[PDB]
Amino acid sequence: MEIVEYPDPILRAKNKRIDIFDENLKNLVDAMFDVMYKTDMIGLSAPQVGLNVQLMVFNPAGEPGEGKEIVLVNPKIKKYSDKLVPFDEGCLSFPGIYAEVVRPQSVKIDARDITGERFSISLSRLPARIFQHEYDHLEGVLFFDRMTDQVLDSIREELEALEKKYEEKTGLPSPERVEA
Ligand SMILES: CCCCC[C@H](CC(=O)NO)C(=O)N[C@H](C(=O)N1CCC[C@H]1CO)C(C)C
Ligand SMILES: [Zn+2]
Ligand SMILES: [Zn+2]
Ligand SMILES: [Zn+2]
Ligand SMILES: [Zn+2]
Ligand SMILES: [Zn+2]
C-alpha cells in the first residue's frame, strides 16, 4: 500500500461509515496493523492508507506481541474530560514533524468492533492520546490544527516544505497552505 501524506486532499475529505463487516474489513485492519508496525507507529487511521472510511487501529505498547491490538469502527466521542494535558506528537502523514499538542486527558467512547457489535469504553493516559489523534483523522482534522500559534509557528517551514513537494509532483498549487 501507499502512505498518504500532507497536504494530500484525502486527509481532509469526509469519511464514510463502514456498514459491511466482512473478510475484506478483517484483511484491511490486518494490513493497517502491518503498516503501523513497519513504519514504527503506535496507531493508524484509514485515510492515511488512501481509504476514506471511519476505521482506526492502535497498540499503545507499539511492539509486536505486546500490549493490545485495539480496533474501532465508526466511533464517536461521547465526552471529553475537562482536564487538558500536553504531550509531544508525531504523524505518519507529516514525515519528521514533532510538536506539542494539548488534548483532554480522558475520553468516553462508543464504537463497533471487527464484526459490528456496538460497545462503549472509556480511555485515559496514552491510549486516550492515540485515540484522539486518530479520531481527529477520521474527521479530516490534522494535528497542527490543534497546536497553539506559538507551536505552529515553529513548524511552518516544515509544513511549507511538504507543500512544495506536493506541488513538485503534481505541478498544481498546494490544495492547502498553512499561510492561509
Ligand atoms: C501520540 C499520538 C498518537 C500518534 C499516532 C502517530 C501515527 C498516526 O499518525 N496515526 O494517525 C504516531 O505513531 N506518531 C508517534 C508519536 O506521536 N509517539 C511515539 C510514542 C511517543 C509519541 C511521541 O511523544 C511517533 C512514531 C511519531
Ligand atoms: Zn498481516
Ligand atoms: Zn499483522
Ligand atoms: Zn519502535
Ligand atoms: Zn517538547
Ligand atoms: Zn496521524
Numbering used by the authors: 1 to 180
What does the paper say about this structure?
Here, we explore the precise structural inhibitory mechanism of actinonin, which is a slow, tight-binding inhibitor of peptide deformylase (PDF), a metal cation-dependent enzyme. PDF is the first enzyme in the N-terminal methionine excision pathway, an essential and ubiquitous process that contributes to the diversity of N-terminal amino acids. The function of the active-site metal is to activate the reactive water molecule involved in peptide hydrolysis. Actinonin is a natural product with antibiotic activity that inhibits PDF by mimicking the structure of its natural substrates (nascent peptide chains starting with Fo-Met-Aaa, where Fo is a formyl group and Aaa is any amino acid) in their transition state.
For all variants of position G41, addition of actinonin to the crystal induced a closure of the protein within the crystal. Nevertheless, as expected from in silico graphic modeling followed by energy minimization, the occurrence of a bulky side chain at position 41 prevented the completion of the closure in the presence of the ligand and, hence, the formation of the hydrogen bond between the backbone nitrogen of Ile42 and actinonin. m of the complex of the variants with actinonin compared to WT as measured by DSC. Remarkably, both S and O forms of the G41M apo-structures in the asymmetric unit of the crystal yielded a unique intermediary structure (“I” state) upon actinonin binding (r.m.s.d. between the molecules is <0.25 Å; see also Figure 2B, zone “I”). In this case, it is likely that the induced-fit mechanism drives the equilibrium by capturing only the O population and closing it to an intermediary step, thus depleting the pool of O conformers that is shifted sequentially back from the remaining pool of S conformers and allows the complete binding of actinonin to the enzyme. In line with the rational design of the PDF mutants, the extent of the structural differences suggests that the underlying motions are dependent on the length of the side chain. Together, these data account for the reduced catalytic rate, as the hydrogen bond is strictly required for the substrate to be efficiently cleaved by PDFs. Thus, our study of the designed Gly41 mutant enzymes reveals that, in addition to the initial and final states observed for the WT enzyme, the conformations of the Gly41 variants correspond indeed to on-pathway intermediates, thus providing snapshots along the trajectory from the O to the C state of the enzyme. Progression to this closure involves intermediary states (“I”) similar to those observed with variants G41Q and G41M in the presence of actinonin. Therefore, from both structural and kinetic analyses, each substitution most likely reproduces intermediates along the pathway that lead to the closure of PDF around its substrate.
